[PDB]
Ligand binder design. Structure first.
Ligand code: HEM
Ligand SMILES: CCCCCCCCCCCC(=O)O
Length: 422
């Protein structure tokens, strides 16, 4: 059983020899050391091998251009068998096409991609906007409140339910299951170290998803209008009508969807407020020119980088950054560093809503695995800020945010916000 990660003070990077820089530490983000640690790696060892880590030996690729190459080169770097830095609880490795190489990756992704196709998103836009306005209206305006459960987690759970047509009153289950899987100490240095609960969740999820498939099939056989959820789409296409007969594909694809959209959406929604707090001239610029919302959504996603990395394994020896990556080595593409690389972005650490190249961010990765839900993610953020401008003249963070323990998700568990209506 992987032991629990206990927080200790992270020293300055200059106190360390290059070979001893270990960025797998899941408290780097919380302690505000990630920026300096990744800068030193970009400047002095952009392709860096760490031989001593709790998750095992690994390479760190930290420059924007080098990450691009690795992410795009599925001929040289495999996404199998996992894309988190460590390993899952033995027996609890779920099959997900995010950790699959072409050509199977392509078959499975194509079988679900229609759920976030633009025509499908347009039909979801009104429900997303309704819920966003209802949630914002319900918020207190005379006192600070925790934005994380009140807004980010609330809207994300509703969205995950809509994607699977999951019972709304059980939506919390999708988040709880996703949080435990992504926060496994063995995989991300997260706080979830009870493996029995992970096995319990796996069975509860297989049963819940199986019940959902059979329930939707029955309702379909009864002539219910086919919805815009993944289940309805899967049951509407010849190749996936029998998907329940293949349980690895079924449970894997559905688990990937909810984990993929769980804390990414949550921390995108919270992170924009943190960026507004650090660069409040950005809020005045936005109020003066709302047209900049779409570009600002890209800049929020660049600055926050809700998912810090994706991991690969070298299919062969590969020369990169003056180093020889050996076949079988684990290679970690640090999006969180790539997006702060001044070789691509001027003033990278600065939140600039009118940033000309904000759309060039690598927060969704690049290559065959580039985030499938990227348009829905941008849609949710665009609606949130449209509805924020309608209601509030100012939003202030009145307390230092509390940040989540993980080397994988970059996020906030507590964000105290004071709203000023207009
Ligand atoms: C800003 C929000 C989001 C972030 C930061 C994010 C992050 C990522 C990243 C980094 C990847 C892999 C990139 C790569 O390896 O090159 C990915 C893939 C994926 N994401 Fe997201 N994502 C977001 C939104 C969403 C949402 C809302 C969903 C669900 C609706 C989703 C579902 C997926 C799926 C299914 C994949 C696998 C695609 C594949 O492997 O072919 N994403 N995401
Ligand atoms: C414990 C092994 C599984 C870890 C969680 C699944 C992998 C992450 C999938 C979501 C990707 C993302 O959110 O960017």
């Amino acid at each position: 059983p992987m032991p629990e990660f206990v927080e200790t003070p992270i020293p300055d990077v200059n106190t360390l020899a290059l070979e001893d820089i270990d960025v797998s530490n899941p408290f780097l983000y919380r302690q505000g050391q990630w920026r300096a640690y990744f800068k030193r790696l970009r400047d002095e060892a952009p392709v860096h091998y760490q031989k001593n880590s709790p998750f095992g030996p690994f390479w760190s690729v930290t420059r924007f251009e080098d990450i691009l190459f690795v992410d795009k080169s599925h001929d040289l770097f495999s996404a199998e068998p996992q894309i988190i830095l460590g390993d899952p609880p033995e027996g609890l490795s779920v099959e997900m096409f995010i950790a699959m190489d072409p050509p199977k990756h392509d078959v499975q992704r194509s079988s679900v991609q229609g759920v976030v196709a633009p025509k499908n998103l347009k039909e979801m836009e009104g429900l997303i906007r309704s819920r966003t306005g209802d949630v914002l209206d319900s918020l207190p305006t005379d006192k600070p409140f925790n934005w994380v459960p009140a807004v980010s987690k609330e809207l994300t759970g509703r969205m995950l339910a809509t994607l699977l047509d999951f019972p709304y009153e059980e939506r919390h289950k999708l988040v709880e299951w996703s949080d435990r899987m992504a926060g496994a100490a063995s995989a991300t240095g997260g706080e979830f170290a009870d493996e029995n609960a992970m096995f319990d969740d796996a069975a509860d999820m297989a049963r819940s998803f199986s019940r959902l498939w059979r329930d939707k099939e029955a309702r379909r056989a009864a002539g219910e209008e086919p919805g815009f959820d993944l289940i309805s789409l899967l049951q509407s296409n010849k190749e996936t009508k029998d998907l329940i007969n293949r349980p690895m594909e079924f449970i894997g694809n559905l688990t990937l969807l909810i984990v993929g959209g769980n804390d990414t959406t949550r921390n995108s929604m919270s992170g924009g407020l943190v960026a507004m707090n650090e660069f409040p001239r950005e809020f005045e610029k936005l109020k003066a020119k709302p047209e900049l919302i779409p570009n600002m959504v890209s800049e929020i996603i660049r600055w926050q980088t809700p998912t810090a990395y994706m991991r690969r394994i070298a299919k062969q020896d590969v020369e990169l950054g003056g180093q020889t990556i050996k076949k079988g080595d684990r290679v970690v593409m640090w999006y969180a560093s790539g997006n702060r690389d001044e070789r691509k972005f001027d003033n990278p650490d600065q939140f600039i809503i009118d940033r000309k190249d904000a759309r060039n961010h690598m927060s969704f990765g690049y290559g065959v695995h580039r985030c499938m839900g990227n348009r829905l993610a941008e849609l949710q953020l665009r609606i949130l800020w449209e509805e924020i401008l309608k209601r509030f003249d100012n939003i202030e963070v009145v307390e230092e945010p509390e940040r989540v323990q993980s080397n994988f998700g970059r996020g906030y568990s507590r964000l105290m916000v004071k709203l000023t209506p207009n």
